[PDB]
Structure 1
């Protein structure tokens, strides 16, 4: 019994290979991914959906984005940057970051590694409930840009969770495995993995020859993701509200919220229809907001940001010393890759090359990991 675990920044996912097929395991709540969140309350510690779904009530003691800290030193540029966005306290313990919370009435602190071991204990359990067996063997994946210390902190995290880590595998390599690209035979191939999520955006170029993988270059954008596509919708609709009602909803938090949630939803809908309607009663000062947006207007609100996703592509290709002619395969992972327009720019840019995108983009990392875990076991 061996699983693959995508230990994620925001969401984690676990997969098992059985009856010749990966099954992606739903959690106790029915969800096939699970927030990488840990909440400390007056009485208990919650993990997964229970934790995410009380953030508003208890933000000070709800820890998330631990992958951002795992295996890093306190004065790491990434630690210092992100801290300004987290409501829980990050503490400097003699060079290493720690997360300070109130737990069962007590001040408590946790290395990011411990917090990530909590998520993995939950993922382990998710598979044990599916399977009606104890699970211990896992393949766990990390980012291609993880240095030794971060890889080690991540293995140590699986070990504390009672896991036998068969292997630590880069996320893009896991995704290439899911499409059986390690099975192709003959000459070497260059493969680009385009991974666009909610905040993260990671591009990776790998070499594959005879099943044997090699990272060639990596490139990122900390400031491009789906949240940014939603912002442009909010701005568009807040200006629509003003043109029609001469009222400014921007100073009302709950109104802005109802509108963002709706946008975020209508976005997902535009990924597979050509228009989305939104009706929100009494959105602001008793004023109803019924509107609609087309795919076209959506893409247009975002045309510069879509195009902008091609720049980490060009950095990645130039560090890897390859013309974009010599890329054989493009693999799409991360939820934002579902946006048809983004798929279209990528197909045109890699005119005549194959886009692998048919496995659920939020599940491909865990899919290939699960595939490889069954092999190593």
Structure 2
């Protein structure tokens, strides 16, 4: 029956379905409504999502992630070459096309970036099928607004490899605006700002809406700013603490630092609705239990410059859109980091107390909108 919406995200992916009058954002078998865009290969299994993410410390070189950054690209792309340094997995050259080389079941294997993204997509496809009790084929998949044709065609190709028929490739900030029904309003054209802060990237797009038609007037942001960086500012806080308490540097230690990063991401989320979080790691480094505390005030202090600095791309987007901030009619909160109370305040203050569209889990908003659009592009939504 139904067509689904899939947010194919740099760090997390999310699938939703328009069904029986509502959009349901669908939890995976672990209970999670977003799913890491991670593929891990071991001696015995190909792991996707959480199981892949949870083992990245014991198996760093064979846990692929960040394929969205390789998709639609040539190997000799500046961006590919820059980013490669940061990854623990190997990226090889297959006639001007990036591949990822891994060890899977004793053998060396390489995969194209759309093949990795196809694995994530297959995983999301199964999540929807488990919920719906039938097979899913038709889907709308989303991409960043700045994506070119080659990147859009590669994302569509990823769907086909996942056994999906892709009804459309649509832009992320547009989906989020569809989630809010911003196009179902009589009157003069509306300027909409999409403030989107995920796990790896920061996107600000301004959009005009009149008669249900969308155009992108401007975009800005930082392809290397997201919740991961706030996690980093936390890791090093605790690397330093650990050292003072124990006279040991866990910094040489790749698995110790990875294990602390997970602890840290977990506490950061707790800090979005509570004012302190506990860190609790058994045998972090050479047999030492690491238990500690962090407050929201402190978390915010360690990130004060990156939080505040998300306002530059906003200003920049407005001046490219040739708009003063008071000419923005709707502001939309997207990406799981927009849950961080301080981020909320700083954007609102900037817009002089104007109320922010956030009633929909910001990390689910893109998938929400893709679900709406998938129903429409089928005929599951009339009148």
**1:264/1:318 CA distance change after superposition, 3 Å:** same
**1:259/1:137 CA distance change after superposition, 3 Å:** closer
Q: Which residue of structure 2 lines up, in the alignment, with residue 355 of structure 1?
A: 356
Q: C-alpha distance in 1, partners of 2:59/2:243?
A: 34
Structure 2 gaps of 5+ residues are 378-382
**1:351/1:152 CA distance change after superposition, 3 Å:** same
The equivalences for 1:70-89 within 5 A come to 70-89=71-90
**1:346/1:19 CA distance change after superposition, 3 Å:** same
Q: Which residue of structure 1 lines up, in the alignment, with residue 215 of structure 2?
A: 214
Q: C-alpha distance in 2, partners of 1:58/1:256?
A: 14
> How big is the shift at 1:82?
1.3
**Alpha carbons 2:207, 2:216 under 8 Å: kept:** yes
> How big is the shift at 1:60?
2.8
**Alpha carbons 1:328, 1:353 under 8 Å: kept:** no
- SS of match in other structure, 1:288: strand
Q: Which residue of structure 2 lines up, in the alignment, with residue 333 of structure 1?
A: 334
Q: C-alpha distance in 1, partners of 2:292/2:220?
A: 38
**1:42/1:236 CA distance change after superposition, 3 Å:** closer
Q: Which residue of structure 2 lines up, in the alignment, with residue 155 of structure 1?
A: 156
Q: Which residue of structure 1 lines up, in the alignment, with residue 184 of structure 2?
A: 183
**1:246/1:162 CA distance change after superposition, 3 Å:** closer
**1:31/1:296 CA distance change after superposition, 3 Å:** closer
Q: C-alpha distance in 2, partners of 1:124/1:156?
A: 15
Name the TM-score, length of structure 2 as normaliser: 0.89
**1:46/1:289 CA distance change after superposition, 3 Å:** closer
**Alpha carbons 2:10, 2:199 under 8 Å: kept:** no
* Stretch of structure 1 that moved more, 349-358 or 7-16: 349-358
**Alpha carbons 2:331, 2:356 under 8 Å: kept:** yes
Which whole-Å deviations, capped at 9, do the CAs of 1:118-155 have from their partners, x for residues lacking one? Answer: 22122222211211112111111010010001101111
**1:60/1:189 CA distance change after superposition, 3 Å:** same
The equivalences for 1:315-330 within 5 A come to 315-330=316-331
Which whole-Å deviations, capped at 9, do the CAs of 1:165-218 have from their partners, x for residues lacking one? Answer: 111110111111111111122011111111112221111111111211111111
> How big is the shift at 1:22?
1.1
**Alpha carbons 2:91, 2:98 under 8 Å: kept:** yes
Name the TM-score, length of structure 1 as normaliser: 0.91
> How big is the shift at 1:258?
5.3
Q: Which residue of structure 1 lines up, in the alignment, with residue 380 of structure 2?
A: none
> How big is the shift at 1:246?
6.2
> How big is the shift at 1:301?
2.7
> Is 1:20–2:10 an aligned residue pair?
no
> How big is the shift at 1:70?
0.9
> How big is the shift at 1:26?
1.6
**Alpha carbons 2:42, 2:104 under 8 Å: kept:** yes
**1:138/1:229 CA distance change after superposition, 3 Å:** same
Which whole-Å deviations, capped at 9, do the CAs of 1:202-240 have from their partners, x for residues lacking one? Answer: 111111112111111111213422232233334444555
Q: C-alpha distance in 1, partners of 2:240/2:95?
A: 49
Root-mean-square deviation over aligned CA pairs: 2.5
> How big is the shift at 1:113?
1.4
* Stretch of structure 1 that moved more, 164-173 or 23-32: 23-32
**1:196/1:160 CA distance change after superposition, 3 Å:** same
Which whole-Å deviations, capped at 9, do the CAs of 1:253-302 have from their partners, x for residues lacking one? Answer: 56555544443333222211233344667766777765443322332232
Structure 1 gaps of 5+ residues are none
**1:13/1:352 CA distance change after superposition, 3 Å:** same
The equivalences for 1:85-164 within 5 A come to 85-164=86-165
> How big is the shift at 1:88?
2.3
**1:315/1:281 CA distance change after superposition, 3 Å:** same
> How big is the shift at 1:39?
2.8
**Alpha carbons 1:16, 1:371 under 8 Å: kept:** yes
> How big is the shift at 1:336?
0.9
**Alpha carbons 1:60, 1:89 under 8 Å: kept:** yes
**1:232/1:70 CA distance change after superposition, 3 Å:** closer
**1:136/1:311 CA distance change after superposition, 3 Å:** same
